[PDB]
């Protein structure tokens, strides 16, 4: 019962602790997902070693060879026993990996600047002066890539024509793109809440375009999946997931 847990750096889910003296092993990290992993470990009774996903991606399937990358691929390859991260539960992913029930719910929305006349995805879709995109090889990118809704297909045609420019490596790169250029970022609503509380000139535009949840990923057939679902439901009912979110979102900014 010693497990390897894969994750990815993403504020406020997983971040390096700030320390004068270097820290080692799991002690290096903090954040909402680290707190969740600690609780799961206590409830389920396993120890673990946190590994950061080597390719730095959440996970998407290659058009050409059907192969996955990112944390999803780490689970398929058995490089990790669990992925404890803001990993979106999606039908395409469910075909190759298992997820616990969700520990947080959210949807794709738009991060942009306040006071503009952009009010929705439809407003972005119909123009080209304001660029827009998403994190490369993550769920939001895959949503647009596969959607048959005209508005979202129109946005994918745009994003996919300027991929090198608008599809970014991380939420951090997308936030900087928003701050340094005329760009709207398609990102998950939980993360937008965090970002806008720290940059008062930024805001969510429109509502949630879809609805999904984050769950702990496991290789298909893992005995840990059902046990982790049970632990999450218990944490949820006890109010612990709500406290954890307040602790890291610090709804104090702005
Ligand atoms: N949480 C997303 C990554 C960020 C995004 O796609 O907006 C994922 O699981 O793929």
UniProtKB/Swiss-Prot annotation:
Chain positions carrying an annotated carbohydrate: 201
Disulfide pattern: 200-254
Annotated residues for binding of L-glutamate: 86, 88, 93, 139-140, 188
Molecular function GO terms recorded: extracellularly glutamate-gated ion channel activity; glutamate receptor activity; glutamate-gated calcium ion channel activity; glutamate-gated receptor activity; identical protein binding; kainate selective glutamate receptor activity; ligand-gated monoatomic ion channel activity involved in regulation of presynaptic membrane potential; PDZ domain binding
Domain of life: Eukaryota
Entry's localization field: Cell membrane; Postsynaptic cell membrane
PTM field: Sumoylation mediates kainate receptor-mediated endocytosis and regulates synaptic transmission. Sumoylation is enhanced by PIAS3 and desumoylated by SENP1.
UniProtKB keywords: Cell membrane, Disulfide bond, Glycoprotein, Ion channel, Ion transport, Isopeptide bond, Ligand-gated ion channel, Membrane, Phosphoprotein, Postsynaptic cell membrane, Receptor, Signal, Synapse, Transmembrane, Transmembrane helix, Transport, Ubl conjugation
Tissue distribution of the protein: Highest expression is found in the olfactory lobe, piriform cortex, dentate gyrus, hippocampus, granular cell layer of the cerebellum, and in caudate-putamen.
A biological process term (GO) from this entry: positive regulation of synaptic transmission
Predominant location: membrane
Ranges in the topological domain labelled Extracellular: 117-254
Cellular-component GO terms for this entry: axon; dendrite; dendrite cytoplasm; glutamatergic synapse; hippocampal mossy fiber to CA3 synapse; ionotropic glutamate receptor complex; kainate selective glutamate receptor complex; membrane
Biological role: Ionotropic glutamate receptor that functions as a cation-permeable ligand-gated ion channel, gated by L-glutamate and the glutamatergic agonist kainic acid. L-glutamate acts as an excitatory neurotransmitter at many synapses in the central nervous system. Binding of the excitatory neurotransmitter L-glutamate induces a conformation change, leading to the opening of the cation channel, and thereby converts the chemical signal to an electrical impulse. The receptor then desensitizes rapidly and enters a transient inactive state, characterized by the presence of bound agonist.
Note: The postsynaptic actions of Glu are mediated by a variety of receptors that are named according to their selective agonists. This receptor binds domoate > kainate > quisqualate > glutamate. It does not bind AMPA without coexpression with GRIK5.
Subunit-level organization: Homotetramer and heterotetramer with GRIK5. Tetramers may be formed by the dimerization of dimers. Assembles into a kainate-gated homomeric channel that does not bind AMPA. Can form functional heteromeric receptors with GRIK4 and GRIK5. Can form functional heteromeric receptors with GRIK3. Interacts with DLG4. Interacts with NETO2. Interacts (via C-terminus) with KLHL17 (via kelch repeats); the interaction targets GRIK2 for degradation via ubiquitin-proteasome pathway.
Family per record: Belongs to the glutamate-gated ion channel (TC 1.A.10.1) family. GRIK2 subfamily.
Protein name, UniProt field: Glutamate receptor ionotropic, kainate 2
Organism: Rattus norvegicus
């Amino acid at each position: 019962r010693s497990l390897i847990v894969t994750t990815i750096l993403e504020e406020p889910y997983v971040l390096f602790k700030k320390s004068d003296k270097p820290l080692y092993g799991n002690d290096r990290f903090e954040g909402y997902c680290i707190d969740l992993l600690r609780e799961l470990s206590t409830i389920l009774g396993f120890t673990y070693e946190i590994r950061l996903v080597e390719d730095g991606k959440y996970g998407a399937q290659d058009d050409v060879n059907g192969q996955w990358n990112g944390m999803v691929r780490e689970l398929i390859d058995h490089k990790a026993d669990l992925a404890v991260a803001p990993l979106a539960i999606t039908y395409v992913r469910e075909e190759v990996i298992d997820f616990s029930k969700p520990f947080m719910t959210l949807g794709i929305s738009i991060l942009y600047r306040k006071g503009t006349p952009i009010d929705s995805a439809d407003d972005l879709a119909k123009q080209t002066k304001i660029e827009y995109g998403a994190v490369e090889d993550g769920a939001t990118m895959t949503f647009f890539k596969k959607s048959k809704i005209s508005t979202y297909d129109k946005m994918w045609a745009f994003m996919s024509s300027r991929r090198q420019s608008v599809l970014v490596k991380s939420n951090e790169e997308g936030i900087q793109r928003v701050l340094t250029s005329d760009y709207a970022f398609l990102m998950e609503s939980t993360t937008i809440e965090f970002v806008t509380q720290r940059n008062c000139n930024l805001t969510q535009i429109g509502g949630l375009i879809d609805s999904k949840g984050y769950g702990v990923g496991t290789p298909m057939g893992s005995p840990y999946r059902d046990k982790i679902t049970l632990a999450i439901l218990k944490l949820q009912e006890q109010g612990k997931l709500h406290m954890m979110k307040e602790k890291w979102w610090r709804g104090n900014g702005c």
